Amino acid sequence: AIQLTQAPLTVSASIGDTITLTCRASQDISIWLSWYRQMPGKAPELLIYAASTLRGGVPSRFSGARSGTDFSLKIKNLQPEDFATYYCFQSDSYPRAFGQGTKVEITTVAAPSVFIFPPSDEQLKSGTASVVCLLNNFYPREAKVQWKVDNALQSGNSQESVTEQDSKDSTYSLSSTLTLSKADYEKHKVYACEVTHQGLSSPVTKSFNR
Amino acid sequence: RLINCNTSAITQACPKVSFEPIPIHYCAPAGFAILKCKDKKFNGTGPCPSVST
Amino acid sequence: DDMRGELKNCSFNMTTELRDKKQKVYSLFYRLDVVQINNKEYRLINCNTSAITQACPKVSFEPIPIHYCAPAGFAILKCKDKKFNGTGPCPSVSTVQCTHGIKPVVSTQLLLNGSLAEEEVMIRSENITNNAKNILVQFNTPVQINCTRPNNNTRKSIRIGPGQAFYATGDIIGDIRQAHCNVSKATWNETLGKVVKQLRKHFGNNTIIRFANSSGGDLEVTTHSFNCGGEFFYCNTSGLFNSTWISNDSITLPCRIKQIINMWQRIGQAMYAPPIQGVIRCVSNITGLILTRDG
Amino acid sequence: QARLQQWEGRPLKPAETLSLTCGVHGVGLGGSGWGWIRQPPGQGLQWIGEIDHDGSHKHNPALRSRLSMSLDTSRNQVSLRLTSVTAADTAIYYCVRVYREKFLIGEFLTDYRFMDMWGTGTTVIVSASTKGPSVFPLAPGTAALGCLVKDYFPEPVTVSWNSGALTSGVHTFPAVLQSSGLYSLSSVVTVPSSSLGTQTYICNVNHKPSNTKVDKRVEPK
Ligand SMILES: *[C@@H]1O[C@H](CO)[C@@H](O[C@@H]2O[C@H](CO)[C@@H](O[C@@H]3O[C@H](CO[C@H]4O[C@H](CO)[C@@H](O)[C@H](O)[C@@H]4O[C@@H]4O[C@H](CO)[C@@H](O[C@@H]5O[C@H](CO)[C@H](O)[C@H](O)[C@H]5O)[C@H](O)[C@H]4NC(C)=O)[C@@H](O)[C@H](O[C@H]4O[C@H](CO)[C@@H](O)[C@H](O)[C@@H]4O[C@H]4O[C@H](CO)[C@@H](O)[C@H](O)[C@@H]4O)[C@@H]3O)[C@H](O)[C@H]2NC(C)=O)[C@H](O)[C@H]1NC(C)=O
Ligand SMILES: *[C@@H]1O[C@H](CO)[C@@H](O[C@@H]2O[C@H](CO)[C@@H](O[C@@H]3O[C@H](CO[C@H]4O[C@H](CO)[C@@H](O)[C@H](O[C@H]5O[C@H](CO)[C@@H](O)[C@H](O)[C@@H]5O)[C@@H]4O)[C@@H](O)[C@H](O[C@H]4O[C@H](CO)[C@@H](O)[C@H](O)[C@@H]4O)[C@@H]3O)[C@H](O)[C@H]2NC(C)=O)[C@H](O)[C@H]1NC(C)=O
Ligand SMILES: *[C@@H]1O[C@H](CO)[C@@H](O[C@@H]2O[C@H](CO)[C@@H](O)[C@H](O)[C@H]2NC(C)=O)[C@H](O)[C@H]1NC(C)=O
Ligand SMILES: *[C@@H]1O[C@H](CO)[C@@H](O[C@@H]2O[C@H](CO)[C@@H](O)[C@H](O)[C@H]2NC(C)=O)[C@H](O)[C@H]1NC(C)=O
Ligand SMILES: *[C@@H]1O[C@H](CO)[C@@H](O[C@@H]2O[C@H](CO)[C@@H](O)[C@H](O)[C@H]2NC(C)=O)[C@H](O)[C@H]1NC(C)=O
Ligand SMILES: *[C@@H]1O[C@H](CO)[C@@H](O[C@@H]2O[C@H](CO)[C@@H](O)[C@H](O)[C@H]2NC(C)=O)[C@H](O)[C@H]1NC(C)=O
Ligand SMILES: *[C@@H]1O[C@H](CO)[C@@H](O[C@@H]2O[C@H](CO)[C@@H](O)[C@H](O)[C@H]2NC(C)=O)[C@H](O)[C@H]1NC(C)=O
Ligand SMILES: *[C@@H]1O[C@H](CO)[C@@H](O)[C@H](O)[C@H]1NC(C)=O
Ligand SMILES: *[C@@H]1O[C@H](CO)[C@@H](O)[C@H](O)[C@H]1NC(C)=O
Ligand SMILES: *[C@@H]1O[C@H](CO)[C@@H](O)[C@H](O)[C@H]1NC(C)=O
Ligand SMILES: *[C@@H]1O[C@H](CO)[C@@H](O)[C@H](O)[C@H]1NC(C)=O
Ligand SMILES: *[C@@H]1O[C@H](CO)[C@@H](O)[C@H](O)[C@H]1NC(C)=O
Ligand SMILES: *[C@@H]1O[C@H](CO)[C@@H](O)[C@H](O)[C@H]1NC(C)=O
Numbered sequence: 001a002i003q004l005t006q007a008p009l010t011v012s013a014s015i016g017d018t019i020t021l022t023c024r025a026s027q028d029i030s031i032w033l034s035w036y037r038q039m040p041g042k043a044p045e046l047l048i049y050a051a052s053t054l055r056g057g058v059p060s061r062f063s064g065a066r067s068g069t070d071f072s073l074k075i076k077n078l079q080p081e082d083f084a085t086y087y088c089f090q091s092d093s094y095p096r097a098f099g100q101g102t103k104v105e106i107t108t109v110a111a112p113s114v115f116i117f118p119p120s121d122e123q124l125k126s127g128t129a130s131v132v133c134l135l136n137n138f139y140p141r142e143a144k145v146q147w148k149v150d151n152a153l154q155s156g157n158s159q160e161s162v163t164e165q166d167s168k169d170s171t172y173s174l175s176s177t178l179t180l181s182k183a184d185y186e187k188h189k190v191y192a193c194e195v196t197h198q199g200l201s202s203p204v205t206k207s208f209n210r
Numbered sequence: 211r212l213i214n215c216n217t218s219a220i221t222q223a224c225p226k227v228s229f230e231p232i233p234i235h236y237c238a239p240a241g242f243a244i245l246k247c248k249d250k251k252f253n254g255t256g257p258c259p260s261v262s263t
Numbered sequence: 264d265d266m267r268g269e270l271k272n273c274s275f276n277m278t279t280e281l282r283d284k285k286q287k288v289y290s291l292f293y294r295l296d297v298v299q300i301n302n303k304e305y306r307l308i309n310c311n312t313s314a315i316t317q318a319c320p321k322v323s324f325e326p327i328p329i330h331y332c333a334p335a336g337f338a339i340l341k342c343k344d345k346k347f348n349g350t351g352p353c354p355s356v357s358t359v360q361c362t363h364g365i366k367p368v369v370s371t372q373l374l375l376n377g378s379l380a381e382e383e384v385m386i387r388s389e390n391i392t393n394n395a396k397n398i399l400v401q402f403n404t405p406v407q408i409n410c411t412r413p414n415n416n417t418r419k420s421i422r423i424g425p426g427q428a429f430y431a432t433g434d435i436i437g438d439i440r441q442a443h444c445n446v447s448k449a450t451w452n453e454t455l456g457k458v459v460k461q462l463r464k465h466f467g468n469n470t471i472i473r474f475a476n477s478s479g480g481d482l483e484v485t486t487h488s489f490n491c492g493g494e495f496f497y498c499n500t501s502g503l504f505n506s507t508w509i510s511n512d513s514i515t516l517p518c519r520i521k522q523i524i525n526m527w528q529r530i531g532q533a534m535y536a537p538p539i540q541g542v543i544r545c546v547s548n549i550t551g552l553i554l555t556r557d558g
Numbered sequence: 559q560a561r562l563q564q565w566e567g568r569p570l571k572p573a574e575t576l577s578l579t580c581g582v583h584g585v586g587l588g589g590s591g592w593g594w595i596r597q598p599p600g601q602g603l604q605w606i607g608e609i610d611h612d613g614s615h616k617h618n619p620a621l622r623s624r625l626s627m628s629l630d631t632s633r634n635q636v637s638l639r640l641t642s643v644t645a646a647d648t649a650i651y652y653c654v655r656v657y658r659e660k661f662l663i664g665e666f667l668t669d670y671r672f673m674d675m676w677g678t679g680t681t682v683i684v685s686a687s688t689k690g691p692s693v694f695p696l697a698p699g700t701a702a703l704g705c706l707v708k709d710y711f712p713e714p715v716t717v718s719w720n721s722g723a724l725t726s727g728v729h730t731f732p733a734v735l736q737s738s739g740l741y742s743l744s745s746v747v748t749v750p751s752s753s754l755g756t757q758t759y760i761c762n763v764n765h766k767p768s769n770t771k772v773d774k775r776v777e778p779k
Contacts, residue, residue, distance in 0.1 A: 034672050049672045050661050096605045117696040134702055134746055161731040173729045175744045216280050436667045
C-alpha cells in the first residue's frame with residue numbers, strides 16, 4: 001500500500017497569516033492527491049483535488065502544488081473557518097490511504113488555577129471513591145497531573161479530560177479523576193494532586209486530609 | 211407482460227398439427243444391422259444370451 | 264492529431280426488447296461511418312444502400328489454412344520450379360493430393376502473410392508490357408509490419424431487441440495516438456532494391472524505376488486495407504511507395520479504422536464490425552506486392 | 559438540494575451484523591460510484607470500501623471477508639453489511655459518492671475518483687445496558703464547584719447550571735469511558751468565593767437515553 005505522511009501534526013497561526021501544509025507520499029502517486037477539511041464536529045469537505053484544482057465554492061486563497069512526493073497546500077488570509085483538521089487522500093493505488101491530519105488552530109502563557117475535591121459521602125456508600133482535580137484556564141494545553149496518596153505516587157488509576165480552546169481567552173481546562181475503592185480510600189489520610197505546567201516555576205500541590 | 215418476452219418471441223403452436231406421438235421405427239441402412247436383446251432379465255449392460263437381428 | 268478527432272459522439276433513440284419502449288443511447292462512431300443530413304444530425308453511411316448485418320461477435324476473422332483437394336478422376340499438378348514466373352513450361356512437376364494450407368488473408372496493396380519466394384523476388388504479370396495488368400511481386404525475405412490501435416476501447420452492449428445486442432464504443436481512454444503500422448526503414452529499402460533489380464530485367468538496365476503512391480478511388484483501393492485483431496485498418500502506404508531508383512529507424516503508416524465494411528467490392532451487403540475491447544496489436548509479414556504501371 | 563441522508567441505527571450488541579443504509583436524493587445511483595467512510599472517535603478517517611461505476615466492489619484489506627455492499631437502484635439506497643462487529647468498530651459511518659472526472663496528464667487520460675458528496679453521519683456504538691448517572695457534588699477571591707456525573711450509558715449527557723442562567727466560568731468536560739464500560743464526566747463553574755453562602759448553585763444534568771434528569775444542589779460541605 002501507499003502511506004501518506006502529513007507534518008507538522010499541529011500548526012498554530014493567528015487570523016490573517018499564511019500557512020503551508022505538507023503531505024509526503026511513500027511512492028510517487030503522480031498528482032492524484034485530494035485535500036479534505038474537517039471542521040470540529042462536522043463532516044469533511046473537499047478543498048483541492050488533483051493537488052491543484054480548487055473545488056467549486058472554495059475561495060481562491062486555498063492552493064496546492066507539486067506532482068511528485070512532497071505535496072503542499074497553502075492557505076492565505078486565514079479566517080476562523082480555516083481552523084480545522086486537514087487530510088490528504090491519495091487516489092493512485094486501490095488500497096486507498098488518508099493522511100494523519102494537520103490540526104490548525106490559533107496561537108498568553110498562564111498557569112492553571114488548581115482545585116481538589118474529595119469524594120462525597122453519598123458516593124462512598126457505593127464502595128468506590130472518586131477524587132477530582134481541576135486545572136482551570138491555562139495555556140498551553142500540555143499539563144501534567146500526578147496523584148499522591150500519603151505521599152505515594154499513584155499510577156494507572158486516573159483518567160483525564162480537556163476542554164476545547166476557549167474562544168475569548170484561548171485557554172484550556174482539565175479535569176482528572178482518581179478512582180479508589182472505599183476500602184483503600186479509608187486506609188489513607190493525605191490526598192494530593194501535584195500539577196506541572198510551563199507557567200509554574202515549581203509544581204503546585206492541592207491536598208486535603210480525609 | 212408475457213414471461214418469454216425478454217428472452218425470445220413465441221412461435222404459436224400451429225393449430226393444425228397434433229402433438230400426439232405416433233410410433234416411429236429407426237431402421238439401419240445397408241451394411242448395418244440392428245441387434246435386439248431378447249433377454250428378459252437384461253438390465254442395461256453386459257452380455258445378452260438371446261439376440262436377434 | 265489524435266484518435267478522438269476521428270470520432271463523433273452520436274446519440275440516438277434505439278428500440279428496447281419491449282416493442283413499445285424506446286431507449287436513449289449513445290455511441291462513438293467514426294467520422295467515416297456517419298453522413299450528415301441537411302449537435303448536428305447524422306446517419307450511418309450504409310443506410311441508403313442496405314442494412315448492416317452485425318459482424319457476429321463469436322466468429323473470428325482470423326484466416327485458417329484451407330486445402331483445395333481434387334475429386335476422384337482428377338489430379339492437382341504442382342509446379343516445383345523455383346524460377347517459374349506464372350506461365351509456360353514447368354520442368355519440375357508433382358502430383359499432390361491437394362494444395363498447401365492457403366490462408367485467405369484479405370488485404371490490398373500488400374500481400375500480408377502467406378508464402379515467400381524461394382531464391383529471389385519474383386515478378387509476375389499477365390502481360391508485363393501492358394500497363395492495365397497488375398504486377399504481382401513476391402518477396403524472398405518477408406518484411407515485418409507491426410500494427411496498432413493504441414486506444415483502450417470500451418465496448419458497450421445495447422439491447423436493440425429480444426435477444427439481439429448491439430455492441431457500441433462507449434468510451435475511449437488510454438494512448439490516443441492515431442492507429443499506425445511500422446515497417447522497418449532499412450528492411451523495406453533493401454526489399455525495394457531487390458524488387459527494382461528484378462524489375463529492370465523487363466524494362467531495361469538504364470531505365471528509372473520510380474515508386475509513387477496510390478492514384479485515387481475508394482478508401483479500400485487507395486489504402487492498404489486489411490483486418491487485424493478483428494478491427495479493420497486502412498493504412499496510407501504513401502511513405503512505403505515513395506522513391507526514385509537510378510541505374511533501428513522505422514516507417515510509420517497512418518491508418519484509419521472503419522466499422523461498416525463493404526468487403527468484397529460489392530454494394531448492398533455491408534457489415535458492422537463491433538468494437539474490440541482493449542488495445543489491438545499486430546505482427547504480419549509483407550510477402551508480396553500488387554503494383555500497377557503508369558502508361 | 560442534492561444530499562445524502564443516512565439515519566441512526568442505534569447501538570448494537572457485539573458480534574452481530576452492521577446494517578447501514580444511505581438515502582440518495584437530488585442525484586441517482588447511476589454513473590458515479592458509492593462507498594463508505596468511517597471515523598473512529600479522536601482519530602482520522604478510514605476507507606471501508608466502494609462500488610465503482612462498472613459495478614465492481616473495492617474492499618479494504620483490513621476488513622477481510624466481513625465486507626459486503628449492495629446498491630438499491632429502485633430505492634436509490636446504498637447498503638453496508640459489516641459482520642462480526644467488534645468494539646474497535648465504534649465509529650461514525652459516512653456514505654460517499656466517488657465521482658469520476660477525467661484529468662489529462664501529458665498523454666494519458668484517467669478516471670479520477672474524489673468522493674464528491676458526503677453523508678451526514680451515523681454514530682455506531684457497540685457495547686453495557688442503558689443506565690442513568692449518579693450525580694455527586696464537587697463541593698467548594700474565586701471558588702470552584704461542580705458536579706461529577708458518574709456511571710452512565712450510553713452517551714450523551716448534557717449539563718447546565720442554574721437552569722442555563724449561569725454560563726460564565728462554566729466548563730463541562732468531555733466524558734471518559736471508564737474501565738467498567740460506563741461513562742463519567744464532570745462539569746465545573748468558578749464563582750466569587752463571597753457568593754458561596756448566599757447564591758444557590760444547581761447543576762442540571764440530563765441523560766436522554768435513560769430519561770434521567772437531575773437538578774443537584776451543590777453546597778459547601
Ligand atoms: C458522449 O456524449 C455523452 C452525452 O450524450 C456523454 O455522457 C455524458 O457525460 C456527462 C459529463 O460526464 C454526464 O454529465 C454528468 O452527469 C451527472 C449526473 O449523472 C446523471 O446522468 C447519467 C446518465 O447516464 C444518469 O445515469 C444518472 O442517473 C444521472 O442522471 C440523473 O438521473 C436521475 C434519474 O435516475 C434524475 O432524476 C433525479 O432522481 C432522483 C432520485 O431520487 C431524485 O428524484 C431527483 O429529484 C431527480 O432529479 C436526475 O435529474 C438526473 N440528474 C442529472 C441529469 O444531472 C452530473 O452530476 C454531472 O455534473 C456535475 O459534476 C461535474 C463534475 O463535478 C461538474 O463539472 C458539473 O458542474 C456538475 O457539478 C455540479 O453538481 C455536483 C453535484 O452533482 C456538485 O458536486 C458540483 O459542485 C456542481 O454543483 C454531469 O452533468 C452525462 O450524464 C453523460 N450522459 C450520458 C448520456 O451518459 C459522454 O461523456 C460523451 N462521451 C465522450 C467519449 O465524449
Ligand atoms: C482498459 O479499460 C478497461 C475498462 O473498460 C479496464 O478494465 C477493467 O479493469 C479493472 C481493473 O483495472 C477491473 O476491475 C476489477 O474487477 C475485478 C473483477 O472483475 C470481474 O467482474 C467485472 C464486473 O462484472 C467484469 O467487468 C470483469 O471483467 C470481465 O468482463 C469484461 C466485460 O464486462 C471483459 O471485458 C473482461 O475481459 C472480463 O471477462 C471481471 O469478470 C476485481 O477482482 C478487481 O480487483 C479489485 O478488487 C479487489 C477485491 O475484490 C481488490 O483486492 C483489488 O486490489 C482491486 O481493488 C477490480 O474490481 C474491471 O473489471 C475491468 N473492467 C472490464 C470492463 O473489464 C482495463 O484494465 C483497461 N486496460 C488498460 C490497458 O488500462
Ligand atoms: C427475463 O425476465 C424474468 C422476469 O423478470 C427474469 O427472471 C427473474 O430473475 C430475477 C433475478 O434473478 C428473479 O428474482 C425472478 O424471480 C425471476 N423471475 C422468474 C419468473 O423467473 C429473467 O432473468 C429475465 N431474463 C433475461 C435474459 O434477462
Ligand atoms: C429521441 O426521441 C425524442 C422524443 O421521443 C426526441 O426529442 C424530441 O425532439 C424534437 C425535435 O426533433 C422536439 O420537438 C420534441 O419536443 C422532443 N421530445 C422530447 C424531448 O420529449 C429526441 O430528439 C430523440 N433523440 C435523438 C433522435 O437522438
Ligand atoms: C447514399 O448517400 C451517400 C451520401 O450522401 C451518397 O454518396 C454521395 O454522393 C454524392 C453525389 O455523387 C457525392 O457528392 C458525395 O460525396 C457522396 N458521399 C460519400 C460519402 O461518398 C450515395 O450516392 C448514396 N447512395 C445511393 C444509392 O443513393
Ligand atoms: C498474419 O499472421 C500472424 C501470425 O499468425 C497474425 O497474428 C496473429 O493473430 C492472432 C489473431 O489475432 C493472434 O492470436 C496471434 O497471437 C497473432 N500472432 C502474432 C505473432 O502476433 C496476423 O494477424 C496475420 N495478419 C493478418 C491476418 O492480416
Ligand atoms: C497520406 O499521405 C499523404 C502524404 O503524406 C497525404 O497527402 C499529401 O500530404 C502532403 C504533405 O504531407 C501534402 O503536400 C499534399 O497536399 C497531401 N495531399 C492531399 C491531402 O491530397 C495524405 O493526407 C495521407 N492520407 C490520405 C488518406 O491520403
Ligand atoms: C447389469 O447386469 C450385468 C449382467 O448381470 C452386470 O454385469 C452389471 O453389473 C449390471 N449392471 C450394474 C450397474 O451393476
Ligand atoms: C514467363 O516465363 C516463360 C518461360 O520462361 C516465358 O515464355 C513467358 O514469356 C514469361 N511471361 C511473360 C509475361 O513474359
Ligand atoms: C511505431 O514506432 C513508433 C516510433 O517510431 C512507436 O512509438 C510505436 O509504438 C511503434 N508502433 C508499433 C506498433 O510498433
Ligand atoms: C515488431 O514487433 C516485434 C515484437 O512484437 C519486434 O521484435 C520488431 O522489432 C517490430 N518490428 C517493427 C518493424 O516494428
Ligand atoms: C498520394 O500522395 C499524394 C501526395 O504525395 C496525395 O495528395 C494523395 O492523396 C495520395 N493518394 C493516396 C494516398 O491514395
Ligand atoms: C513471419 O515469417 C517468419 C519466417 O519468415 C515467421 O517466423 C514469423 O512467425 C512470421 N510472422 C507472422 C506470421 O506474423
